[PDB]
């Protein structure tokens with residue numbers, strides 16, 4: 150379970166980091 | 181405690197997957 | 212270690228919520 154939890158939260162931060170980059174670009178392109 | 185963490189972890193991951201979907205749609209819509 | 216995982220999960224959720232608000236604003240202004 151601990152591995153399971155560490156892996157899922159890592160995955161979460163990695164995808165969150167990536168979406169922040171995408172949102173930052175859309176924001177610039179937009180208004 | 182560990183169980184309530186898993187709960188938050190799985191919830192965060194689900195919302196991240198949804199956001200990915202929202203962002204793919206926005207990137208296409210905005211171009 | 213449990214506390215580091217809890218910090219990470221909370222940061223993960225904070226970012227997620229924040230991205231939901233950013234996406235929500237983009238969608239309202241996009242159209």
Ligand SMILES: [Zn+2]
Pocket residue numbers: 167171
């Ligand atoms: Zn992407």
Ligand SMILES: [Zn+2]
Pocket residue numbers: 198202
């Ligand atoms: Zn949505």
Ligand SMILES: [Zn+2]
Pocket residue numbers: 229233
């Ligand atoms: Zn922001």
